[PDB]
Amino acid sequence: TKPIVFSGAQPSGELTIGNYMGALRQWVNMQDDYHCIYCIVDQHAITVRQDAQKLRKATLDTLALYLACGIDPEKSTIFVQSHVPEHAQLGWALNCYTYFGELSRMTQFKDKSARYAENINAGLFDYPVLMAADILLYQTNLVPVGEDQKQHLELSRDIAQRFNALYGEIFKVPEPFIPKSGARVMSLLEPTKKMSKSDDNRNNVIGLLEDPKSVVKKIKRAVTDSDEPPVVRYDVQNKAGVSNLLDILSAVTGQSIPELEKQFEGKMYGHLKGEVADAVSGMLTELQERYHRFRNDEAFLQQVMKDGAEKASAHASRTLKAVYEAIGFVAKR
Amino acid sequence: KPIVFSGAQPSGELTIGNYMGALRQWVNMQDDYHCIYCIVDQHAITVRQDAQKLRKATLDTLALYLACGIDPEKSTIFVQSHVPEHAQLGWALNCYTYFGELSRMAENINAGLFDYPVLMAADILLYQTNLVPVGEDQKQHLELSRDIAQRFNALYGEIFKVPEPFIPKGARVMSLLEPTKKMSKSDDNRNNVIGLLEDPKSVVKKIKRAVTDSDEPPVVRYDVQNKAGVSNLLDILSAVTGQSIPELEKQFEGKMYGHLKGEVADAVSGMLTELQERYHRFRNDEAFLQQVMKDGAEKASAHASRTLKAVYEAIGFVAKRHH
Numbered sequence: 001t002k003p004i005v006f007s008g009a010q011p012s013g014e015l016t017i018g019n020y021m022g023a024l025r026q027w028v029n030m031q032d033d034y035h036c037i038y039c040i041v042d043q044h045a046i047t048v049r050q051d052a053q054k055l056r057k058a059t060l061d062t063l064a065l066y067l068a069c070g071i072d073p074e075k076s077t078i079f080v081q082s083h084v085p086e087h088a089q090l091g092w093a094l095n096c097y098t099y100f101g102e103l104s105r106m107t108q109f110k111d112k113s114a115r116y117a118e119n120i121n122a123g124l125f126d127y128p129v130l131m132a133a134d135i136l137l138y139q140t141n142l143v144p145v146g147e148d149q150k151q152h153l154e155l156s157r158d159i160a161q162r163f164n165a166l167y168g169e170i171f172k173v174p175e176p177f178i179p180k181s182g183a184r185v186m187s188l189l190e191p192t193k194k195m196s197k198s199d200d201n202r203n204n205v206i207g208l209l210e211d212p213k214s215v216v217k218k219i220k221r222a223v224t225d226s227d228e229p230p231v232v233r234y235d236v237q238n239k240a241g242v243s244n245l246l247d248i249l250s251a252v253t254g255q256s257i258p259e260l261e262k263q264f265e266g267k268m269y270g271h272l273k274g275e276v277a278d279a280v281s282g283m284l285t286e287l288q289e290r291y292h293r294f295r296n297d298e299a300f301l302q303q304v305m306k307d308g309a310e311k312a313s314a315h316a317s318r319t320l321k322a323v324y325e326a327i328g329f330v331a332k333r
Numbered sequence: 334k335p336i337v338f339s340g341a342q343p344s345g346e347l348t349i350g351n352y353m354g355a356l357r358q359w360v361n362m363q364d365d366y367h368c369i370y371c372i373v374d375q376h377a378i379t380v381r382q383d384a385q386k387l388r389k390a391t392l393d394t395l396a397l398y399l400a401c402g403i404d405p406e407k408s409t410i411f412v413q414s415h416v417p418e419h420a421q422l423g424w425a426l427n428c429y430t431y432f433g434e435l436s437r438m439a440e441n442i443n444a445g446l447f448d449y450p451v452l453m454a455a456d457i458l459l460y461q462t463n464l465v466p467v468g469e470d471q472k473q474h475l476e477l478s479r480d481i482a483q484r485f486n487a488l489y490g491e492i493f494k495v496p497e498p499f500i501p502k503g504a505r506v507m508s509l510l511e512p513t514k515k516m517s518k519s520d521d522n523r524n525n526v527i528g529l530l531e532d533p534k535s536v537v538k539k540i541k542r543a544v545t546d547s548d549e550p551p552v553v554r555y556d557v558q559n560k561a562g563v564s565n566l567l568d569i570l571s572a573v574t575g576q577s578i579p580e581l582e583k584q585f586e587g588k589m590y591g592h593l594k595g596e597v598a599d600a601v602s603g604m605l606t607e608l609q610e611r612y613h614r615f616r617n618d619e620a621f622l623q624q625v626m627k628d629g630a631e632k633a634s635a636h637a638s639r640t641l642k643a644v645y646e647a648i649g650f651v652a653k654r655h656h
């Protein structure tokens with residue numbers, strides 16, 4: 001049987017080129033090599049207050065966007081998190097094997113709390129435990145994520161090991177799969193800040209479903225540096241904006257930064273931004289064309305959701321039963 | 334009928350205080366209310382404990398509740414973990430609970446110890462519960478559940494019933510060696526308690542050590558301030574036999590505390606022997622217990638699923654596509 005890949009994305013905000021390069025791109029390329037399972041994590045999304053109509057539409061938007069990226073429901077399992085109760089069941093049980101301090105130290109909880117001081121809720125704090133349940137339910141070997149999720153993956157490993165050490169080989173210990181390019185795409189006007197799918201300043205982001213012409217304008221206005229002469233060279237410390245642009249370009253074209261640096265020898269930021277906008281505009285145009293054929297076919301989205309929840313449930317129920325037997329619950333009839 | 338939700342913790346043997354002071358009265362209220370008894374194994378694991386003892390204690394608790402008279406045809410009795418909706422609603426309600434609310438209820442406590450008040454709130458709100466017979470140590474938990482229900486309702490409509498404490502109490506069973514303290518199932522000093530499974534020799538021994546007073550002559554008279562131990566023995570005897578405190582005071586005129594203790598032990602063990610016979614009959618019948626759990630979980634999930642669906646609809650989740 002193939003090793004198992006699991007990963008998820010929130011139906012909140014609007015997925016960006018950052019979400020694509022750090023995660024979805026890898027999701028698509030691993031579908032034959034591994035047994036892949038991809039999740040729309042609507043239970044995680046509501047740790048930030050959502051409008052109910054927005055959340056429903058965004059869940060379906062996200063599903064269609066997975067399909068548009070090339071996630072293939074005949075190859076991978078695609079499902080909505082709340083459709084599989086085992087996620088919440090194992091999440092509760094794993095609370096009891098997770099320490100308070102492991103959660104309080106989390107960068108995401110601290111960043112999100114500062115952004116939403118009016119809604120610092122227990123779900124936001126408990127977020128990593130539910131994520132660990134997401135992963136461990138499927139005997140997951142590889143978890144393809146961006147860099148910002150490293151700390152959460154590491155906790156899920158610590159939980160798997162702690163539980164296994166008491167109870168036996170109940171969980172696989174997952175490993176992160178973080179790309180060499182595009183693991184942390186940066187904001188266009190603030191290249192020291194991760195690109196956000198919920199930025200108040202849209203000029204910082206390249207949304208997957210955004211008008212390509214709007215994206216191309218945003219690329220040209222991306223901040224660079226004062227170097228004289230202007231030089232296309234990778235240096236995150238001193239040339240954050242140029243470096244981020246090179247990263248996006250490498251991640252879309254598959255070309256190395258060394259290659260790109262040589263290609264831009266004797267050129268300046270106009271050539272750099274012209275190729276970035278060309279490559280990204282082409283990607284988004286093709287993506288969006290596939291997207292609408294999937295997004296407006298409710299019967300197909302309904303079918304994918306149904307089959308996917310059924311496949312996931314068969315795996316998740318097996319793991320949960322072993323977990324419940326190990327901790328000592330009377331098994332359900 | 335109003336819906337009553339009670340959570341029965343697997344670990345810890347029930348005492349005569351638990352039985353005469355509450356369960357016995359709830360047993361005769363099963364036609365007045367729609368009573369739900371949830372054996373809360375998911376709450377139990379906030380404290381690390383041996384797995385096989387937890388399984389046994391889950392079944393022990395079920396058989397004892399049956400033995401005390403909970404009627405699975407009249408009331409709903411089930412194991413918490415058998416109903417996924419509890420964890421499902423718990424997660425959702427996490428997202429409507431302030432971190433500060435849980436902190437106001439360190440780095441090495443597990444997250445379940447910190448988060449179980451939200452699971453409690455989900456346990457109650459799942460069943461459109463009207464009444465909850467909390468202990469005094471759970472009043473803040475109930476009040477959080479009410480706060481969560483009102484917060485959610487104010488956002489989404491009247492999805493949840495706002496639960497109320499069960500106010501009325503009602504027999505007074507105090508610790509045998511410390512009569513100012515109530516008899517508690519969780520007491521480490523097992524000599525303060527009489528468990529429902531204790532044999533007549535154990536009851537005699539614990540009653541004989543029960544603290545009395547130095548009155549001379551010894552006088553069997555009710556006085557909680559000045560004669561707490563003798564008063565506790567009198568309350569226990571009256572709770573078992575139904576005889577009034579004045580009647581017992583007349584019955585023990587000119588008698589010593591050894592006489593009183595002898596009758597207390599005899600009365601307590603008489604009451605316990607009928608309960609113990611039923612306990613062991615139920616406990617050793619695997620199929621009966623399995624049927625009770627299967628039926629109870631089916632009844633509970635049927636109600637819980639209706640609430641969860643409404644909650645999920647209010648939040649905006651895409652509804653599940655069943656096969």
Ligand SMILES: CC(=O)NCc1cc(Oc2ccc(-n3c(=O)n(C4CCNCC4)c4ncnc(N)c43)cc2)c(O)cc1F
Pocket residue numbers: 338339340341342373376377379380446449452453456457465466467468470471
């Ligand atoms: C007596 C009664 O029926 N009360 C109502 C009621 C009880 C329910 O069951 C539980 C079980 C355990 C707790 N609980 C709980 O009450 N505590 C402490 C015990 C000492 N005093 C402060 C509160 C807990 N500590 C750790 N883990 C827990 N799970 C704790 C809390 C609740 C329950 O799940 C729902 C419910 F409505």
Ligand SMILES: Nc1ncnc2c1ncn2[C@@H]1O[C@H](COP(=O)(O)OC(=O)[C@@H](N)Cc2c[nH]c3ccccc23)[C@@H](O)[C@H]1O
Pocket residue numbers: 006007008009010011017018019020021022023041044130131134135143144145146147148149182183184185186194195196197
């Ligand atoms: N600017 C960026 N550059 C590169 N990668 C980025 C950027 N911003 C985000 N990412 C990555 O996108 C994925 C989805 O992010 P979400 O916020 O939806 O989603 C998250 O951040 C997860 N908690 C969702 C989740 C829930 N359970 C899981 C289990 C396994 C893996 C993932 C999950 C992630 O891989 C994230 O690292």
Ligand SMILES: O=c1[nH]c2cc(Cl)ccc2o1
Pocket residue numbers: 087088089090091092095126129130131133419420421422423424425427448451452455
């Ligand atoms: O990960 C988690 N935490 C949780 C807390 C409750 Cl109350 C229920 C399910 C959960 O899953």
